[PDB]
């Protein structure tokens with residue numbers, strides 16, 4: 001039995017919404033948001049982690065291309081290999097590709113492992129969001145309805161299961177009969193419901209939300 005609804009924001013495991021600007025660093029934002037939750041669960045401290053560190057440092061060896069896109073899984077692998085990631089404060093986001101400037105003097109978190117969930121399985125995603133923490137996922141965001149979303153449960157009949165934008169599932173629920181995933185985006189507070197979008201849940205892997213989910217853990 002899983003809870004009927006989950007909201008990790010209420011358990012203090014979610015940092016302020018970030019603003020990626022012109023740079024396709026959604027994957028980095030998704031990755032740090034997932035690790036921020038684990039850091040809080042382990043240490044009690046909620047600390048924004050450096051998306052810029054990932055953009056600049058988890059690069060070709062990780063199949064990542066900074067502002068041109070990347071993968072949350074290989075971002076986790078970089079944090080494992082690197083033995084750390086800097087705080088956002090120390091290594092701020094600039095919405096552009098820079099030289100790697102990782103400095104262990106400002107290490108704010110580590111990662112020991114990550115787990116990838118099976119393709120399209122919204123049940124397995126629900127279990128992880130309930131039992132483990134916020135989960136990094138991709139979605140198909142290439143529709144004007146997504147960009148223009150303001151409120152309620154988002155459903156786009158033209159959506160596909162092929163992902164192109166990284167976001168973070170921080171919960172799930174039901175809004176007057178419409179089941180949803182509660183998603184933290186990185187398009188600032190101006191987007192959606194103060195930075196969040198509620199996306200259709202149990203609607204055949206809508207927009208690919210359960211196509212490629214993953215989450216990190218800290219030893």
Ligand SMILES: CNC(=O)O[C@H]1COc2ccc(N3CCN(C4COC4)CC3)cc2[C@@H]1NC(=O)c1ccc(F)cc1
Nearest residue numbers: 024027064065068069070071137138163164165166212
């Ligand atoms: C800017 N958008 C952005 O980064 O979106 C992220 C969102 O998260 C995910 C999650 C899963 C996947 N999968 C793709 C398919 N792959 C299967 C295995 O064999 C094919 C599994 C992993 C892709 C992505 C996206 N990455 C890119 O599209 C991307 C774009 C340019 C790059 F250089 C690198 C990456």
